[PDB]
Amino acid sequence: GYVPAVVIGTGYGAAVSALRLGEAGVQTLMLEMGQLWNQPGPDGNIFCGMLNPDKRSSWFKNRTEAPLGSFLWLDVVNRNIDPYAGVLDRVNYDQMSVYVGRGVGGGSLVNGGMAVEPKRSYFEEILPRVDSSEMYDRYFPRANSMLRVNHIDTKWFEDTEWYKFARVSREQAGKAGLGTVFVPNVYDFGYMQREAAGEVPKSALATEVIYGNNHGKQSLDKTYLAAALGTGKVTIQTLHQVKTIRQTKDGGYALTVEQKDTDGKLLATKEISCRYLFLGAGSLGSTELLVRARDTGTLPNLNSEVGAGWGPNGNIMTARANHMWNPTGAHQSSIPALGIDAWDNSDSSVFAQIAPMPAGLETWVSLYLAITKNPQRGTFVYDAATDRAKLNWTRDQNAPAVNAAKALFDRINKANGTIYRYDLFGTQLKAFADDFCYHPLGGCVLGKATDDYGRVAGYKNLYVTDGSLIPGSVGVNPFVTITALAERNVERIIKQDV
Numbered sequence: 001g002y003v004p005a006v007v008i009g010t011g012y013g014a015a016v017s018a019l020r021l022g023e024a025g026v027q028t029l030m031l032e033m034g035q036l037w038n039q040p041g042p043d044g045n046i047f048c049g050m051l052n053p054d055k056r057s058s059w060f061k062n063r064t065e066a067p068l069g070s071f072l073w074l075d076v077v078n079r080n081i082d083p084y085a086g087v088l089d090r091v092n093y094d095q096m097s098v099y100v101g102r103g104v105g106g107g108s109l110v111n112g113g114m115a116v117e118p119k120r121s122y123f124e125e126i127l128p129r130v131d132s133s134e135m136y137d138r139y140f141p142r143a144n145s146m147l148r149v150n151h152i153d154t155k156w157f158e159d160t161e162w163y164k165f166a167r168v169s170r171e172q173a174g175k176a177g178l179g180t181v182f183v184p185n186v187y188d189f190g191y192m193q194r195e196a197a198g199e200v201p202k203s204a205l206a207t208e209v210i211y212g213n214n215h216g217k218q219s220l221d222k223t224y225l226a227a228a229l230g231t232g233k234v235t236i237q238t239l240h241q242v243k244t245i246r247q248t249k250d251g252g253y254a255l256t257v258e259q260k261d262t263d264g265k266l267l268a269t270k271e272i273s274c275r276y277l278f279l280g281a282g283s284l285g286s287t288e289l290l291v292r293a294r295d296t297g298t299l300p301n302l303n304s305e306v307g308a309g310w311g312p313n314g315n316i317m318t319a320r321a322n323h324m325w326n327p328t329g330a331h332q333s334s335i336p337a338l339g340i341d342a343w344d345n346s347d348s349s350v351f352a353q354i355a356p357m358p359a360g361l362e363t364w365v366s367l368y369l370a371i372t373k374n375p376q377r378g379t380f381v382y383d384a385a386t387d388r389a390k391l392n393w394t395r396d397q398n399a400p401a402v403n404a405a406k407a408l409f410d411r412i413n414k415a416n417g418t419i420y421r422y423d424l425f426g427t428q429l430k431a432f433a434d435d436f437c438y439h440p441l442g443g444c445v446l447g448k449a450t451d452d453y454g455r456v457a458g459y460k461n462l463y464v465t466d467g468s469l470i471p472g473s474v475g476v477n478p479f480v481t482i483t484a485l486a487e488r489n490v491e492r493i494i495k496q497d498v
């Protein structure tokens, strides 16, 4: 029942932490509520694609859903399903829906693989207490290398039909005096070229991403987690969800963990104790565990900052209708490669990802996922009645985000004589999706709810390592920052505490 170190979750913060702990000789147990995705399903594949969604696509839902922005073309493939331990979870709060991965590797299993370093000037603005030289000289480079970030071949990108959708938006943005930038990725671009050449099994070129990629994507299970297990000091137990956390009579930590099967049936409740406890359950998971512990009195010394400072990384989705002479293509790589960088740290800052659409036929639609600078923050409040942390965030709090996104795309529409699509997110004439989030950030902010390295305030040997540490915004796709920060944190923690 005892293990020196326990890491809750297997996402970015968790993976980095477990690898370094293992390398330092600390026997570590990782607890993951989702599945280890390595068994072929009904179609001979581990994951289901976006055009053939089944129970594997969702975390305990009774019906599949179309990827945001593609309901008009993909609802036709939606089917009723048995609640199952699927890979993608849509967590619905009062006025916000947060998408998170569930499985060994966490969000790395379902994300777009976009590996982007935040602008240094912005990093220094959001985390002034952190030494930025150390982050850019050592931690970002280390994260880049271990994550296996790579770059797309420009010649191939320019010629391939699979990225015509990206080229169309580049041309359109150019007329408004806006340039584009290549987005590094963990998806093997060399493999992607071979897919287009019909030399290897297609994944990104076979409408796969949001429910996992059967090939090509260097998710954490192949990188950090593989290395962690390789140390001989790390083990991973799946379908194990931590419910409570308390401090033992001697300073260690005890956890109640529920083991379930893939159908969600409770198989057993175990008691696991440790000397060092690392939380890597994500922005939602780690914050909920802490607000629960504080409010139920199992960790009575947690401060008032626990639960505060949450932000959706200013996530806003919108789309533009192209002229008939600017078709985006029926064949679109599921992995984005280009983005529009209009981020100058001001309130009008927008870094938008040119997103592909899975329809498989010509729709003339250009889809974009904008990351904005919105000061609004939400707070996770514990509800003792349902034993769930509720996110206090209202839709109108995304107004500044919508405004920033709209001002940028209005410029592109004006320069091209194009208009927005208003029917992609429902039948209510909404050109901007403002109640979804792929990048949850905050809840246990670094330096507020914890010290500058993630040590939870009020406790010893208790650490938070994931996206809950970030103060609601990074101005870019978040995983590289979470990874780099985790490298910085665990290295210091092992040196001084272990």
Ligand SMILES: Cc1cc2nc3c(=O)[nH]c(=O)nc-3n(C[C@H](O)[C@H](O)[C@H](O)COP(=O)(O)OP(=O)(O)OC[C@H]3O[C@@H](n4cnc5c(N)ncnc54)[C@H](O)[C@@H]3O)c2cc1C
Pocket: 008, 009, 010, 011, 012, 013, 014, 031, 032, 033, 034, 099, 100, 101, 102, 103, 104, 105, 106, 107, 108, 110, 111, 112, 113, 114, 115, 116, 210, 240, 241, 242, 243, 280, 281, 282, 283, 285, 286, 289, 438, 439, 440, 465, 466, 467, 468, 476, 477, 478, 479, 480, 482
């Ligand atoms: C569709 C989609 C697209 C995205 N695209 C990108 C992109 O291209 N680039 C980018 O930078 N970011 C992207 N992201 C966001 C990125 O995936 C997340 O920011 C990142 O995965 C967060 O890492 P984390 O370590 O905080 O937590 P997560 O990766 O979320 O991992 C948390 C893990 O903890 C497990 N866990 C939860 N609670 C418990 C519990 N109580 N007990 C046990 N285990 C638990 C979860 O099941 C999970 O496996 C996207 C996310 C989604 C949903």
